[PDB]
Write a protein that binds this ligand. Structure first.
Ligand code: NA
Ligand code: NA
Ligand code: NA
Ligand code: NA
Ligand code: NA
Ligand code: NA
Ligand code: NA
Lengths: 173, 173, 173, 173, 173, 173
């Protein structure tokens, strides 16, 4: 049952990739939830909605790239349930950005653990894959979300509705 | 005196269409009133004025489409007086948007009653006409006005003149 | 309560402008009625319908220009009910053109009274506005309608259905 | 023998669609007959001929769309004989337009019965298909033919050969 | 807590839309699973992979449109876990197409139940939404999958590897 | 009652043209039946469907050209019922092509009899019409269908579903 393509690809690496697929799909779902919160008539921040929908689609692309990797290396994809997000109501633009920052840091931690595993199993292709496609993307995402949180806080969010309105227009628009 | 084209078109449907024509013309007049309120030198919100004038013209188009339908089906148009709007002075951008939301919901209720009548009289052409041309347009209008009211309220309208100014520029501009 | 912009604008002038707004809106409604008469399956003169719809839209533009003037001068718009037209059935192309000619002459008489008022109140801006935007437009409209009535009568309308058909095609098309 | 695609598609609906196919093919044949009547050297109204040929081709397209629907839903097409039209000689442009109006109203009645059946069998796809593709097309056709009959009658057809000549040129050309 | 936009939108309808969102997301996940099965080195049917990935993305779009509808009507989105697909290994191109056909028929049945609910609750906007955006799309999908299953079976799949190869090239390519 | 245009046009020729019109319309209907057989979900050969629909439309054009001829010569068109095709289910691509070949040979035989009649009645215009517009078209059609039957038989149709699939793609596509 060993794939004809498989070479230097540890069972532990294969399992870790399957976990990461699920995590990326989860993140996609979280961002989808956040997007449609901002689309509510009682929230009505269209550029927050657009921002989070974009992130949702990006996370799905990240999951699909891991699925491609799994097959390229001769591993086998095992999908699991995608858990529902922790919240239905995301409270405010600031709260959502803070939740996103926490999520991105959790995803980054998982990727750092995957890189460590790849290094420990002497799998340089996998290590390089993670470095090239995932780690700088995560650092950039985290920096962007931190910048957003800083700006929102400085502007007076979430108490000032005018802050979120103007941030939506000027930063996210 | 029965029209050569008339088929499956109940007298009650014909009467309901004449009522809806009047209601659309009324709505057009309300929006016209609102438009020119915002054009006053002591109000001076040009994009509110433009928004409501556009809505006025759209409502007139809606009325004319119903008039076309009446003739297409072999009904006879009977026009009535167009009543003056309830207010001359619309107080604020927020108050006008709230009044518009109420108006749109009243128009939607009338269209839902018309659809029910068409269904009750087994007039699928009329039911389809209302679904295709009126019902989603109303849902969209109501959602847009609700979004506007939410944003204005969050920004601090009507107490903050700066709120209405910035909404006029950034949302309606 | 005097507008910051108001200068040399008499209360009687302001009232006369509000009356003229109503008259223009009334004329728009009359022409709308006439338009849709010609769209009936038992009348079926598409170019008569188009002609009168154009006139309807033009009269609305005339009303809106007066509303703009009212605000430019610091007067206050007071809308009134728009009365229904005198007829539902306009009988013939010739009869409608004759009714239009009568309407246009009534509107012109009202504008001449407004000009006289402006002159009497030493309001040269208002007098000029009426001269520039309204009086030659009315003279042209009246001359055009008179030409149409003459042609229809000479061709044998309304007794000849062939007359109205050919006029619809060759003059109004 | 149940199609793998079939879902929510009643035997009565399938039968009614087969009847409607035949009716559309019949209508196509009627219009073909009318077309070539106008092409006769002793009739010689080329634009009447063109008008009816266009209608013939349109009715065939309508039949083919129903055949497509039958297969989409997993029903089975059963064709029947296409009966010859009621007349060989259509007498006049006015008489043909009156016969067309009668035909279109008969087709519309059949479509309204089909819609009622679809609604009674809780087949919303079929009901929507009929509403979307057939009912407004029929209302428009009926209104157009009524307009044509009105104009021809007003112009003096069929006694005036000049009426049909000019209608052929100016309306149908 | 009633939304300012909500009108004629039953709690049962809102709940049914939330169920349909989950079902569409589930279908998206199934198709994703199927896609990456065909990308395996021991399966290696690139056009099957592309076909199912396209379907996955389409189902996600369908889910997002329902989420938009929920907010447009003033309902509240409640997400649930996305269950993992029933299979990890989809056996063959034919087996996957058969599983897809079964899935599409299940989704269609759910949409027909939603339409019945909308009709029962006199919600014509919702009924129209389902008819316009979902029901013909499902009929087309089901017909396409049935055609694919027929062709694969006729060609000798799944026993003939040459059948799936050639179908992949000529139909899906 | 003799047409003003009629010259050298025998009553027997006129009758034979009316028979040929019916035969062409019949052939059109046969091909229509065949087309929609191939569109069935349990047959699913789209290029066979397209091929036969094209032939259906071509046969209708042939019928209309004969109708034009009848009027050009001052004959009078008498339409008859269009009989339903002999089969509802055409069994296979090969069987349909064989049935088409038989049909085309039957149509050709009728045209050869018409040419013989024209020659016997010293009607060179009619003979030339048939030669120019019909006889080479029939020879080409017969040769094409024979080629198709040969290829299908050589490839292993109808027992090989792979044969019809590949013929559909490579010859008819
Ligand atoms: Na990611
Ligand atoms: Na409206
Ligand atoms: Na509909
Ligand atoms: Na005027
Ligand atoms: Na039709
Ligand atoms: Na779907
Ligand atoms: Na032929």
């Amino acid at each position: 049952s060993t794939s004809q393509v498989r070479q230097n690809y540890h069972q532990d690496s294969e399992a870790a990739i399957n976990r990461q697929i699920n995590l990326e799909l989860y993140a996609s779902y979280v961002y989808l939830s956040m997007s449609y919160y901002f689309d509510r008539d009682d929230v009505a921040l269209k550029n927050f909605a657009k921002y989070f929908l974009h992130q949702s689609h990006e996370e799905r692309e990240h999951a699909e790239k891991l699925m491609k990797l799994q097959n390229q290396r001769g591993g086998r994809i095992f999908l699991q349930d995608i858990q529902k997000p922790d919240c239905d109501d995301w409270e405010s633009g600031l709260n959502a950005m803070e939740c996103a920052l926490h999520l991105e840091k959790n995803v980054n931690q998982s990727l750092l653990e995957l890189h460590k595993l790849a290094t420990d199993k002497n799998d340089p292709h996998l290590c390089d894959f993670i470095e090239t496609h995932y780690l700088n993307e995560q650092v950039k995402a985290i920096k962007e979300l931190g910048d957003h949180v800083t700006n929102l806080r400085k502007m007076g969010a979430p108490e000032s509705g005018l802050a979120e309105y103007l941030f939506d227009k000027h930063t996210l628009g």
